[PDB]
């Protein structure tokens, strides 16, 4: 799922290619910082200056609008606004865009095509906020242009620019283990699959070729170098594990599945 997105927190702004952070903001100089050489994508130095400026102008006018309507709406200091915005590419289809705003920890208002619509949850207070945000349609057009035109042109150049890093295949390292006991008389079997890239992986407990349906995937867990770590578990009774095995499938393996036996 090829997505690029930006997040604001109100102060930190950053750019993410899914779980991978690619851009960070420097307020000390009002410039965009590139975490990877290829973070520049297919944009030029001129164009990045323009975008630097674009964000600065807009980031300010925006968070100054809140302060402008601070009393008119809700709760005053301290406050937390979270914003996420971006695009996703689809093979064969039209690209997605999103721009969403949360008031404290809950959905507030979001941008749909060319205007702002409230969430029902946020009730009447968000309604008033959208009459405010939608009064100048030209401002909305710009938002639209960035979301549904700028962003997709970028994410293409960006994926292209970092192919040698994103198209990288890192083989996983796998081992078996006990987990904490589910209960009396029973074992939790754990299959650890560690250090792999990219994220999609298939792990399953197997008595022969019969997939065990009780196989539980845990969270996919990150480490600093961008690789992933995943535990697949199965709760079996004490004498019923001798003929079980964990099978790992991955793109790096190129056919050759990892098969571990409990034995």
């Amino acid at each position: 799922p090829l997505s690029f997105h930006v997040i604001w927190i109100a102060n930190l702004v950053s750019g993410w290619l899914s779980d991978l952070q690619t851009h960070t903001w420097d307020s000390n100089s009002s410039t965009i910082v590139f975490l990877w050489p290829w973070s520049r994508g297919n944009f030029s130095n001129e164009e990045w200056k323009e975008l630097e400026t674009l964000f600065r102008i807009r980031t300010i006018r925006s968070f100054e609008g809140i302060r402008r309507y601070a009393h008119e709406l809700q709760f005053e200091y301290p406050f937390e606004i979270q914003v996420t915005g971006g695009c996703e590419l689809h093979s064969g289809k039209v690209s997605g865009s999103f721009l969403q705003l949360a008031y404290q920890g809950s959905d507030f208002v979001s941008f749909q095509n060319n205007s702002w619509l409230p969430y029902p949850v946020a009730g009447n207070m968000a309604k008033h906020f959208c009459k405010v945000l939608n009064q100048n349609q030209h401002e909305n057009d710009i938002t639209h242009n960035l979301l549904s035109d700028t962003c997709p042109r970028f994410i293409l150049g960006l994926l292209d620019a970092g192919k040698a890093h994103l198209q990288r295949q890192v083989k996983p390292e796998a081992w078996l283990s006990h987990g904490p006991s589910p209960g009396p008389g029973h074992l939790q079997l754990v299959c650890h699959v560690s250090g792999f890239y990219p994220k999609p992986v298939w792990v399953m407990w197997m008595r022969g070729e019969q997939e065990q349906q009780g196989t539980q995937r845990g969270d996919i867990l990150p480490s600093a170098d961008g690789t992933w770590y995943l535990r697949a578990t199965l709760e079996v009774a004490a004498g019923e594990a001798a003929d079980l095995s964990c099978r790992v499938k991955h793109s790096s393996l190129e056919g050759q599945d990892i098969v571990l036996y409990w034995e």
Epitope: E50, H144, N145, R153
Partner: T-cell receptor
Amino acid sequence: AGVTQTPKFRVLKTGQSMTLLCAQDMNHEYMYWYRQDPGMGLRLIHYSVGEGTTAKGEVPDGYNVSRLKKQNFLLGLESAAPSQTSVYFCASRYFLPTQGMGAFFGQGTRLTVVE
Amino acid sequence: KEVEQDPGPLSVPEGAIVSLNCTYSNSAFQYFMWYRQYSRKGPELLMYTYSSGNKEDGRFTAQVDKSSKYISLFIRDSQPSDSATYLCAMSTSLPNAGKSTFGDGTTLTVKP
């Protein structure tokens, strides 16, 4: 008060130099120097995205520019040629307008270069 | 080739609806402007629209059709006062360096 160009007419001898001054008091970041020859449209000579920087347009050869303040944008010819006989337009706009795109234009400078 | 505007000239009789048009080949165009230039004056901005749609302002209607890459300025009940040169201009999506491409202009004369 708008965009102002000085001079409005000028006659040069081949080889001579002149400077055209464009001025705007609208606090615009972008400024432009265009030339218009019949039968064509506007073509961009140079432009500037803000105080202190300038950039080339389509036909920058034989011209130079200066962005001295936000307010002023200078077009210079260091050695006038017959092909620079034309009308020169200056324009400006905000970097990021709130009332839509489109630029404000000066009234033109007719420059005739003669041998 | 990036912006093509019919050169004309156009001489139409007073009262006629006049259509000025440009076609473009760059699908990245998103901002569409019409300028009017009276003889020996500067271009004045006449109509602007963002992306596809119609915007109406009095006797003027500006239309952009992105799938046809074809934009138009219509003038209802053309008056002699409408005699001028009409330039279209277009910009790509952000970032666009603030630049726009101009068509070579259409000269319109409205005979009284």
